Short mmCIF file of C-alpha atoms in Angstrom, two decimals:
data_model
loop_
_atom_site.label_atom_id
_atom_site.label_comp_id
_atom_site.label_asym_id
_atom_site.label_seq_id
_atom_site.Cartn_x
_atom_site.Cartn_y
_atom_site.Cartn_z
CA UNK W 1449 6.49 17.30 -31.65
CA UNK W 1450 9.37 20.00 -31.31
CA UNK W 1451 11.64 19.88 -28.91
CA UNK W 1452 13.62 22.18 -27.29
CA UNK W 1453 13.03 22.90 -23.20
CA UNK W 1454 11.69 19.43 -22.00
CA UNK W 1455 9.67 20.11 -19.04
CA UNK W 1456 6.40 18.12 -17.44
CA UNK W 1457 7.41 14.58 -17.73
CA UNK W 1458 9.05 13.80 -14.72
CA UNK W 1459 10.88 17.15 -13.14
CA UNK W 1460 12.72 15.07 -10.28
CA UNK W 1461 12.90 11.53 -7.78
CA UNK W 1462 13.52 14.02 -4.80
CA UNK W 1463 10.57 16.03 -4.94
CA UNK W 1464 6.89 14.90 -5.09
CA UNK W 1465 3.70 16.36 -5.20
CA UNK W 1466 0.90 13.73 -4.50
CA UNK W 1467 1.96 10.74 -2.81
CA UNK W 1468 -1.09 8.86 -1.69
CA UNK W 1469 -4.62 9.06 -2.43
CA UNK W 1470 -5.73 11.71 0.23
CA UNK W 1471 -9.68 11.65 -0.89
CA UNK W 1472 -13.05 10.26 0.47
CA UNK W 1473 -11.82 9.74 3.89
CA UNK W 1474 -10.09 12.92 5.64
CA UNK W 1475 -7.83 10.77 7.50
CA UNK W 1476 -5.81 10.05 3.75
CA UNK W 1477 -5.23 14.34 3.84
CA UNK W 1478 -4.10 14.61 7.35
CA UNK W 1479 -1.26 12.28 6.42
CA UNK W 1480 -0.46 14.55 3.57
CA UNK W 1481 -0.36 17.34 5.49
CA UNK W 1482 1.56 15.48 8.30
CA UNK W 1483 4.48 14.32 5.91
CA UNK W 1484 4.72 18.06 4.64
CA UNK W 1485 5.35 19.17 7.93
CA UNK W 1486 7.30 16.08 9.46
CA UNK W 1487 9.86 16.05 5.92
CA UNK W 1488 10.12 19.53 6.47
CA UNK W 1489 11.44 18.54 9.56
CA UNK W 1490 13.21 15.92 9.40
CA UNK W 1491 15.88 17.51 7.39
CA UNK W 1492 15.73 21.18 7.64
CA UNK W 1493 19.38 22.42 5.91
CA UNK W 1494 19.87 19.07 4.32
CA UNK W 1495 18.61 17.34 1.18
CA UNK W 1496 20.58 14.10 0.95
CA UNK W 1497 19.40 13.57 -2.50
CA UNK W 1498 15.80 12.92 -0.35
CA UNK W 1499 15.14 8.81 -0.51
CA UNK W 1500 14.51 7.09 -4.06
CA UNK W 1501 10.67 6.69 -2.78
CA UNK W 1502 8.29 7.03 -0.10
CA UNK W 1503 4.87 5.42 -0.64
CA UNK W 1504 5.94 2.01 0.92
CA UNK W 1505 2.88 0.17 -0.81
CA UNK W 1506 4.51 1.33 -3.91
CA UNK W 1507 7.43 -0.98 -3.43
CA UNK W 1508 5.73 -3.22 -0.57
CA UNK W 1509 2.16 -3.37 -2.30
CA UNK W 1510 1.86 -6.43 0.67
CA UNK W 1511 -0.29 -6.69 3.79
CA UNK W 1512 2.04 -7.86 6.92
CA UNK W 1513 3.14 -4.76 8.81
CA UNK W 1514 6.45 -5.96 10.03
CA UNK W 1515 8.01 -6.17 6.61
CA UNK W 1516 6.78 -2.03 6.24
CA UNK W 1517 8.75 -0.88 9.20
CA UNK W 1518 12.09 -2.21 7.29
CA UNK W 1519 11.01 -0.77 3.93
CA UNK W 1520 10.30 2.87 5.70
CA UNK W 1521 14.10 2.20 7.28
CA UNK W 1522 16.08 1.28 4.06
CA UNK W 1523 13.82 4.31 2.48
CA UNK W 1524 15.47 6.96 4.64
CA UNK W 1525 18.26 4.86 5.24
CA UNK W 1526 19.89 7.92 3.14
CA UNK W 1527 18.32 10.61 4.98
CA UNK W 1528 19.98 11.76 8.17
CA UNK W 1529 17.36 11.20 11.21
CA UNK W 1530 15.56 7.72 11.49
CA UNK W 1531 11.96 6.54 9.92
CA UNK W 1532 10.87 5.76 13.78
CA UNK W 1533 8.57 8.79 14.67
CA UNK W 1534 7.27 8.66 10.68
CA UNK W 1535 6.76 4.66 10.60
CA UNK W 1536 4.76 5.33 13.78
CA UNK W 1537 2.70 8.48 13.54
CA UNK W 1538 2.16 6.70 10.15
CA UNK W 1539 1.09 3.53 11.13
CA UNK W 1540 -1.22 4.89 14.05
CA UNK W 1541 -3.12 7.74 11.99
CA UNK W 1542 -3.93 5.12 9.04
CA UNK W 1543 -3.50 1.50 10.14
CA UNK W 1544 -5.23 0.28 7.10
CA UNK W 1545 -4.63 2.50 3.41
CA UNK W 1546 -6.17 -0.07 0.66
CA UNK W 1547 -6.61 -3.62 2.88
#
C-alpha cells in the first residue's frame, strides 16, 4: 500500500503494552497492575533505554525457577536498581504462569 508515516507495526522495545496474559484468573491482572506501578518505580527520572525484554518465559520458555532469577537479573542488568524485590513479589504472587 502507500507509504508515507509508518506507524502500528512495532512503535518501540522500551515500551510495552500487554506483557502477559492477565485473563481467566485475576491473579494474571494483579501482576499487570503490579509491574505498572513497581517500573514506575523502579526508575522514576531515568529510562536507561528500559531492558531489551521482560516476560522471562519469552526468552526462558523453561520450568526450573533458579535459571529465572538470572534471566530477570541480566534483564535489568541495564536498569539502575536490582530485579530482587520484582523476581520476588513476582515469583510469590504467581508461582506457576503456564506449568
Amino acid at each position: 500500500g502507500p507509504g508515507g508515516s509508518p506507524g502500528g507495526l512495532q512503535k518501540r522495545h522500551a515500551r510495552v503494552d500487554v506483557k502477559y496474559d492477565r485473563r481467566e484468573l485475576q491473579r494474571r491482572l494483579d501482576v499487570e497492575k503490579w509491574i505498572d506501578g513497581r517500573l514506575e518505580e523502579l526508575y522514576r527520572g531515568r529510562e536507561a533505554d528500559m531492558p531489551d525484554e521482560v516476560n522471562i518465559d519469552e526468552l526462558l520458555e523453561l520450568e526450573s525457577e533458579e535459571e529465572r532469577s538470572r534471566k530477570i537479573q541480566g534483564l535489568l542488568k541495564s536498569c539502575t536498581n536490582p530485579t530482587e524485590n520484582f523476581v520476588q513479589e513476582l515469583l510469590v504472587k504467581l508461582r506457576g504462569l503456564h506449568k
